[PDB]
């Protein structure tokens, strides 16, 4: 799954970009209360994710300040890395403008586009553009947003997956803490254990009888 060349052309036209959006970078801002904001940065090159170029930025602050976080991210990254042809920010006029002013703060300029927080409305050049549902440019920006979100959500993936696995295993009668922990450490996630054979599960815990119950509950 990538961004269709024809939709990229349509985006180009909408934003009056003179340059084809060959590199698009997108930012999610997600705050961990009392700790730091994690900014997650994705990269599309020629419409496809370039996963090796993905990065995060951490902005230490007890309370959220998404405008400062975007500013900080833009300044940190683009003082070191080349600008993309287009920057996407997951949020509305304020977040887009925060990025633009940060770029100005370091002498830089590139087009910045947003989608207003979950309200599929395009944000560009201090304006909202309200497109019909299913407009191709809307669909394309949502795909970029979905990828920024997917990358953001993956920050806590290993811990979350173990917790979700543990929650299911808590419902297997007779399992016990030691064998529950063995399964969690061995498998890591529900997706992985759901692909295992009875025999693998039985080997991990030393009981085929309990392994059958784990299969029943899965």
Swiss-Prot record:
Transmembrane segments: none annotated. It is found in: Cytoplasm. Belongs to the UvrC family. The UvrABC repair system catalyzes the recognition and processing of DNA lesions. UvrC both incises the 5' and 3' sides of the lesion. The N-terminal half is responsible for the 3' incision and the C-terminal half is responsible for the 5' incision. Interacts with UvrB in an incision complex. This is UvrABC system protein C. It comes from Thermotoga maritima (strain ATCC 43589 / DSM 3109 / JCM 10099 / NBRC 100826 / MSB8). The gene is uvrC.
């Amino acid at each position: 799954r990538g961004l269709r060349k024809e939709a990229l052309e349509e985006l180009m036209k909408l934003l009056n970009m003179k340059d084809f959006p060959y590199r698009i970078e997108g930012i999610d801002i997600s705050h961990l209360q009392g700790k730091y904001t994690v900014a997650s940065l994705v990269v599309f090159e020629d419409g496809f994710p370039k996963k090796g170029d993905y990065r995060r930025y951490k902005i230490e602050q007890d309370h959220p300040d998404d405008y400062e976080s975007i500013r900080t991210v833009v300044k940190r990254r683009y003082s070191k890395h080349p600008l993309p042809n287009l920057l996407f920010v997951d949020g509305g006029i304020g977040q887009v403008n925060a990025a633009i002013e940060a770029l100005k703060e370091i002498g830089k300029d590139c087009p910045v586009v947003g989608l207003a927080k979950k309200e599929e409305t395009v944000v560009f050049e201090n304006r909202e553009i309200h497109l019909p549902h299913d407009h191709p440019v809307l669909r394309l920006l949502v795909q970029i947003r979905d990828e920024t979100h997917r990358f953001a959500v993956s920050y806590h993936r290993k811990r979350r997956e173990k917790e979700s696995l543990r929650s299911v295993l808590d419902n297997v009668p007779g399992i016990g803490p030691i064998r529950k922990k063995k399964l969690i450490e061995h498998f890591g996630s529900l997706e992985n254990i759901r692909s295992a054979s009875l025999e693998e599960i039985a080997r991990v815990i030393g009981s085929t009888e309990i392994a059958r119950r784990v299969l029943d509950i899965l």
